[PDB]
Amino acid sequence: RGKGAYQDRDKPAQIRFSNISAAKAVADAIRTSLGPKGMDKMIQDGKGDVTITNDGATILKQMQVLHPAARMLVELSKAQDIEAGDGTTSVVIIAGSLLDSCTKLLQKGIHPTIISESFQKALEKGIEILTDMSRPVELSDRETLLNSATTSLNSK
Amino acid sequence: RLTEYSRTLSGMESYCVRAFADAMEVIPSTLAENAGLNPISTVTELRNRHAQGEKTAGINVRKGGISNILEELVVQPLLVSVSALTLATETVRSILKIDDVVNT
Amino acid sequence: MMDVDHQIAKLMVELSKSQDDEIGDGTTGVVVLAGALLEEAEQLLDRGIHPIRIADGYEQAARVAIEHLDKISDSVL
Amino acid sequence: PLSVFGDRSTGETIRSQNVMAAASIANIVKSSLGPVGLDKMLVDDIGDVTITNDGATILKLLEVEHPAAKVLCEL
Amino acid sequence: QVKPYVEEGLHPQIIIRAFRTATQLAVNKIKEIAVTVKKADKVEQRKLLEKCAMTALSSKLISQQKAFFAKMVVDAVMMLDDLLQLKMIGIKKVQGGALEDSQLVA
Amino acid sequence: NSGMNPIQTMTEVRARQVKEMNPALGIDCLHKGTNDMKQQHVIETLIGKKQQISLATQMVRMILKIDDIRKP
Amino acid sequence: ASLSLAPVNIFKAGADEERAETARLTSFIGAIAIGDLVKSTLGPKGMDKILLSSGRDASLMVTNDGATILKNIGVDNPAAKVLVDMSRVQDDEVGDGTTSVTVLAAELLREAESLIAKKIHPQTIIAGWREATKAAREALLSSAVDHGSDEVKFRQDLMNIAGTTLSSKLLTHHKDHFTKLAVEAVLRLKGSGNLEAIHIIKKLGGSLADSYLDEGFLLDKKIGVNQPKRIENAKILIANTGMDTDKIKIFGSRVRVDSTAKVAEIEHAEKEKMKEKVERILKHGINCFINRQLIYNYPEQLFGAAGVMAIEHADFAGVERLALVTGGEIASTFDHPELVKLGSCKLIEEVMIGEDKLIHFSGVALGEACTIVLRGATQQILDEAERSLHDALCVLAQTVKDSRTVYGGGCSEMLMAHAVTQLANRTPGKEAVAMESYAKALRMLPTIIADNAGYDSADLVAQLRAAHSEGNTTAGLDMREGTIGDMAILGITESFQVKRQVLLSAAEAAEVILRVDNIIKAAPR
Amino acid sequence: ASLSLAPVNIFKAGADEERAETARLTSFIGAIAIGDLVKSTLGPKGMDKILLSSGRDASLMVTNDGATILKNIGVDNPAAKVLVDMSRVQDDEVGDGTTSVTVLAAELLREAESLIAKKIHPQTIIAGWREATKAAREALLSSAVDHGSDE
Numbered sequence A: 001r002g003k004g005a006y007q008d009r010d011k012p013a014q015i016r017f018s019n020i021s022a023a024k025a026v027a028d029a030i031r032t033s034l035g036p037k038g039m040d041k042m043i044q045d046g047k048g049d050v051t052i053t054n055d056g057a058t059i060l061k062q063m064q065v066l067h068p069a070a071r072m073l074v075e076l077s078k079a080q081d082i083e084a085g086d087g088t089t090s091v092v093i094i095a096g097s098l099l100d101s102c103t104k105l106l107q108k109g110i111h112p113t114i115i116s117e118s119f120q121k122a123l124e125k126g127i128e129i130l131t132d133m134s135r136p137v138e139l140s141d142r143e144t145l146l147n148s149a150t151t152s153l154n155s156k
Numbered sequence B: 001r002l003t004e005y006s007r008t009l010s011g012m013e014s015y016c017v018r019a020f021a022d023a024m025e026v027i028p029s030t031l032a033e034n035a036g037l038n039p040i041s042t043v044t045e046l047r048n049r050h051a052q053g054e055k056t057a058g059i060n061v062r063k064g065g066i067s068n069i070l071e072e073l074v075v076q077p078l079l080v081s082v083s084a085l086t087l088a089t090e091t092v093r094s095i096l097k098i099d100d101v102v103n104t
Numbered sequence C: 001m002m003d004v005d006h007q008i009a010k011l012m013v014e015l016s017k018s019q020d021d022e023i024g025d026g027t028t029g030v031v032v033l034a035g036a037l038l039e040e041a042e043q044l045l046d047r048g049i050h051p052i053r054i055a056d057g058y059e060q061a062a063r064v065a066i067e068h069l070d071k072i073s074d075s076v077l
Numbered sequence D: 001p002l003s004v005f006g007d008r009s010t011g012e013t014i015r016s017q018n019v020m021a022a023a024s025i026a027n028i029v030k031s032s033l034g035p036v037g038l039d040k041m042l043v044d045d046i047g048d049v050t051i052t053n054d055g056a057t058i059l060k061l062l063e064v065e066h067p068a069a070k071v072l073c074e075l
Numbered sequence E: 001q002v003k004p005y006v007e008e009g010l011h012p013q014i015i016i017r018a019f020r021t022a023t024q025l026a027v028n029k030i031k032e033i034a035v036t037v038k039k040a041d042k043v044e045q046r047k048l049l050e051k052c053a054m055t056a057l058s059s060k061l062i063s064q065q066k067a068f069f070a071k072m073v074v075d076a077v078m079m080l081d082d083l084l085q086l087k088m089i090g091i092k093k094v095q096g097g098a099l100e101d102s103q104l105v106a
Numbered sequence F: 001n002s003g004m005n006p007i008q009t010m011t012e013v014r015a016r017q018v019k020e021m022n023p024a025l026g027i028d029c030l031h032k033g034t035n036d037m038k039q040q041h042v043i044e045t046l047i048g049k050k051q052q053i054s055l056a057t058q059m060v061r062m063i064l065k066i067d068d069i070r071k072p
Numbered sequence G: 001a002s003l004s005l006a007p008v009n010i011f012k013a014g015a016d017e018e019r020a021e022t023a024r025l026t027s028f029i030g031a032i033a034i035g036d037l038v039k040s041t042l043g044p045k046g047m048d049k050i051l052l053s054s055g056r057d058a059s060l061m062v063t064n065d066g067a068t069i070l071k072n073i074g075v076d077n078p079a080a081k082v083l084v085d086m087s088r089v090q091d092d093e094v095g096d097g098t099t100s101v102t103v104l105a106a107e108l109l110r111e112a113e114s115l116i117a118k119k120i121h122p123q124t125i126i127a128g129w130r131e132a133t134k135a136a137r138e139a140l141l142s143s144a145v146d147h148g149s150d151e152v153k154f155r156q157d158l159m160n161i162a163g164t165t166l167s168s169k170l171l172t173h174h175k176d177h178f179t180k181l182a183v184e185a186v187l188r189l190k191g192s193g194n195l196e197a198i199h200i201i202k203k204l205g206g207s208l209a210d211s212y213l214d215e216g217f218l219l220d221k222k223i224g225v226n227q228p229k230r231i232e233n234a235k236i237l238i239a240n241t242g243m244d245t246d247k248i249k250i251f252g253s254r255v256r257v258d259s260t261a262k263v264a265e266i267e268h269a270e271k272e273k274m275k276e277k278v279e280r281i282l283k284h285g286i287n288c289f290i291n292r293q294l295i296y297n298y299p300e301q302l303f304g305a306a307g308v309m310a311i312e313h314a315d316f317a318g319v320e321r322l323a324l325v326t327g328g329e330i331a332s333t334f335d336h337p338e339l340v341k342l343g344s345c346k347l348i349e350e351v352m353i354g355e356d357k358l359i360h361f362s363g364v365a366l367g368e369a370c371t372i373v374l375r376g377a378t379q380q381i382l383d384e385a386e387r388s389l390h391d392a393l394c395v396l397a398q399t400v401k402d403s404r405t406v407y408g409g410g411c412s413e414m415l416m417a418h419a420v421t422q423l424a425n426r427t428p429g430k431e432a433v434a435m436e437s438y439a440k441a442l443r444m445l446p447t448i449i450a451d452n453a454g455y456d457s458a459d460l461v462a463q464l465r466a467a468h469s470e471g472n473t474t475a476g477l478d479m480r481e482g483t484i485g486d487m488a489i490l491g492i493t494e495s496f497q498v499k500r501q502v503l504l505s506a507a508e509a510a511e512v513i514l515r516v517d518n519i520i521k522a523a524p525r
Numbered sequence H: 001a002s003l004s005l006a007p008v009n010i011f012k013a014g015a016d017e018e019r020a021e022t023a024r025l026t027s028f029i030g031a032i033a034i035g036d037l038v039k040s041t042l043g044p045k046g047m048d049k050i051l052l053s054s055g056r057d058a059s060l061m062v063t064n065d066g067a068t069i070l071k072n073i074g075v076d077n078p079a080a081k082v083l084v085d086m087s088r089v090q091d092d093e094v095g096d097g098t099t100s101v102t103v104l105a106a107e108l109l110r111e112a113e114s115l116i117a118k119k120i121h122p123q124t125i126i127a128g129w130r131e132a133t134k135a136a137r138e139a140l141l142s143s144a145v146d147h148g149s150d151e
């Protein structure tokens, strides 16, 4: 082909790297509050109010993050809380990991549009796999309900 | 399974799907972490056991190792993992389609 | 000639000066190689590996690479 | 990188800080325990004087800033 | 370890006496159980010196070349005459080159 | 730097090096039409490469070994 | 001499002026900066921008709309203000083309700067641009194709136009689903142009593909305490009465008695009046009652005892949309039940969307009013999806009003540039150079569109120019692979109104900016 | 990432850094400003300039010489410094051509800015300019006429 198009801007790459760094920093922040052996964080707002919490959405929205990528991750956690109510930390860590991988993907010389479509394909395949692993459950089975509730409360 | 699917593909999309799978490996590493286990060895044992066909093999913090977890009663509904994956992928796709910041 | 304040940047500057003094060429390759090594070490550390073990593995791989370079080297008159 | 407008303490630092705050609160009232204990004499920075041995009164009158020390006070 | 006992008001002289007795016992035990070789073998002495130097060096950044640096150190020390004066061992630092490029000049 | 796609070019050159045993295949920075540096006469001293690798490894080892900063 | 460079000073402190060269320099710099900022968000492969507000709330906005980008920026360059107002007016007129018109104006002003540097009087440039604009407008009008007579062909054109409009925005991921949604929503208006009849409800959570167009209607209001939560074969009465401490409008009236028994009697009379009003409302034979204003506790229980739903505080837009979707009449007097038409729908119930509850009207009679539920992962995603859907709906409504369509993908710009070049090749003087610059800007538009995708823009533009010169009038950019193709076959079409407005507004703004040779600023407040 | 646009700050107070966009923009602006300033003093109908010193002496001088105009100006743009040094060296080597060389360099850099805007790698521009310079020098040498024989 030859030399090809010359990237005159270099500023979009800087913006992408900054956004990814912010998201990865947010994930590393809320990374230690995951699982039954996780711990809670104490957050003090502008006033004297003190919050001790393990909920990822509460941790994210309680502290002002000042970065657009971090704010979008906070909105992501809020949306996950709305639709699901738990797994608010896992989704944020997943997004941070995805963007961290996107760092090396972009550095390898891949346009940030092939990455998006490939991520969509991977998401569809992963949805298929997760549905394959799923097991049917009915509300009449109290043991499964109790196990789910206990698993939810294990990390608090 | 996504590593296998990436191996079934070709071009830059194979690399992107490989990165996707390697990013999905982060949560198991974090679960191995925070519990005193060795993350690398625990994650490798998870991968090996799942390759052997153990679909329900997971991190067992009670015994400080790896075992079946359906006997440990550690389950969550599907519309937690599915929702998290879908929302995270959509957010990442939205973030990737950004190339400038303007101060209002 | 770069006015840096970070100590690691000063270490990079001294590494370039060391490469210049010892050889005189390749003063730009060393910085890129060190940056790539530390970038990979970042994601290795994120997975829970002691940095000393990363350094030991890097030393082993460097020995292997140096031996390979000696193997594939060619002589000139 | 986190870009949070505040101060962050993580790991053994915050744990030791909380334990030190709780230890300070305990040490304030540790001298008023038991029959051989002795009362204290609080001044309200305006001339008001309070002489008491009750732990609740002492912890209520004091103005406390650290969250863990507070936790002990409301305890 | 002795901070708690201090906190109940234990007399500091008792703690000092206990430390003194424990230290005397520990020093005597160290002198008793320390391994020494009374053979005056030059090869064995060199091996012992090299092992001690390796152990003293296996905590620094030159721990990867610890055997090689320990061999240099033993060779350098064995050539001092009777006082083992530090000023008789030159240390020259020249920028550039790997650790394996470092040399000892006889 | 030469405008080529990095990952694709590197993968192709690596595959060529693996297939045919030839450690002389590199990047065609000047677009001379061949990937073999022997004919292109791209020559580097072995001492330079060895020094590069050694110095980079030692500096990385130091940077990894540091775990505290105490600036005033 | 000049006011600024005179021995005596004629201004107050803080007020200055810029003469010919300086004014032209500042205007061109501002226009080029605006064009460069708004571009790179153009075409199918354009990226979005982050608008981080510096205000106290620090509003965060991720957008691709050029008009919104230019709206929320602190602009001090007056020519930049002209361009921003152009973009806003373009958005007001039609939903799309804001980025296109802004970039075209910026490129025109860049060409004007080059011509001025080439020692050409600006009036000559303006005359040449007027002639070129006339020629380009004639060519575009001659290139328009109309398909409104054929129902199926018009529907296909609507789908193509919606897809082309949504190609650049974030909804390009689910372009097919969103295009079908937008086309159905617009077609449900039955020819009416009021986009206010289409309500977009943004509910957080869920994938962007979970968005859907409700078959009936959705309301975000509540129901009385003792009223049914589900009715079948509803007979709806929409009203705009008070029913809240309803006072007789004689403002000077008062109760003036000499005993508390009389006060109690008057209070009972007031309650009786309210009960009589409720009875008159019920005389219409209704199942569900919707009031624009508040409904107090007494009418609430009066409706509850009658088993009648009473939805309160549905604002003017709410009652208008309910009247449109159900066919009822917004009534404020109930002395003539036979003169009032009641809206009808098959089912009214409460649905569970996200964590919120909404009232769902199913099987509506008229249905000339739509509600669209948008599900997203972030608030920014929801806002951008709403803006993109608004753009698509605006363009579709314009196409419904005027069915003439032109081919996109740079085909229209290439045809305009070809016509302008043909005109310029038979004109003496420097006006020919001015028209050549006009054509250069018109060609630069698809050049930027191609650059945004990373393709060889110069080669593609040369191929397109050659094809248009040969006679291929439908050739355009194919961004599936990065070649040229037939826009008719590939189904990239745009509204003729949007392209005409873009061309004319860009030419007008370039003309008005170019005429300026002196900028005088008063002392800032 | 970038040296300046990173969460950690790697510079002393007052140190700056401009990446590709900013570096090219500043270089082109400085070069074009220098070229525009020194031009209009070119050709038989060129005009002169007034150089007013801001120091204590406040030395006054009018000149048509490009080298003297470029010497006695406070210049902060580094590319402008490059062009000023070019003009001074040209004056040192030969007496004339100080304005022409600066104008030619400014026009070349303006064309380079246009080419970069057209998404052309600067190395390709440099190679093409080297070929063009070789051809132009050959043509100019072939066009030269010598009259040193006849007095």
Ligand SMILES: Nc1ncnc2c1ncn2[C@@H]1O[C@H](COP(=O)(O)OP(=O)(O)O)[C@@H](O)[C@H]1O
Binding pocket: A033, A034, A035, A036, A038, A056, A086, A087, A088, A089, A090, A151, A152, A154, A155, A156, B031, B059, B060, B061, B074
């Ligand atoms: N007893 C347990 N043993 C092993 N893993 C567990 C146990 N309880 C919870 N987990 C895991 O911990 C992960 C994190 O859950 P949690 O810490 O509650 O945060 P979130 O609910 O936001 O993901 C879950 O994905 C779950 O699989």
Ligand SMILES: Nc1ncnc2c1ncn2[C@@H]1O[C@H](COP(=O)(O)OP(=O)(O)O)[C@@H](O)[C@H]1O
Binding pocket: G041, G042, G043, G044, G046, G066, G096, G097, G098, G099, G100, G163, G164, G165, G166, G167, G168, G169, G408, G409, G410, G449, G477, G478, G479, G492, G494
């Ligand atoms: N699928 C496509 N193929 C080629 N060109 C397209 C396509 N979709 C949109 N375009 C072009 O992109 C240009 C800009 O459209 P867009 O960015 O959506 O809104 P605006 O007109 O406000 O910039 C249009 O002129 C259109 O010709």
Ligand SMILES: Nc1ncnc2c1ncn2[C@@H]1O[C@H](COP(=O)(O)OP(=O)(O)O)[C@@H](O)[C@H]1O
Binding pocket: H041, H042, H043, H044, H046, H066, H096, H097, H098, H099, H100, H101
């Ligand atoms: N009589 C003339 N007719 C046409 N061109 C001329 C004449 N005299 C000078 N020039 C042109 O003017 C240009 C500028 O020369 P000048 O302004 O004297 O200084 P410099 O050569 O340093 O720019 C020269 O390149 C020359 O070709």
Ligand SMILES: [Mg+2]
Binding pocket: A086, A087, A151, A152, A153, A155
């Ligand atoms: Mg949970």
Ligand SMILES: [Mg+2]
Binding pocket: C025, C026
């Ligand atoms: Mg070199």
Ligand SMILES: [Mg+2]
Binding pocket: G096, G097, G164, G165, G166, G168, G391
């Ligand atoms: Mg559009």
Ligand SMILES: [Mg+2]
Binding pocket: H096, H097, H098
């Ligand atoms: Mg001259």
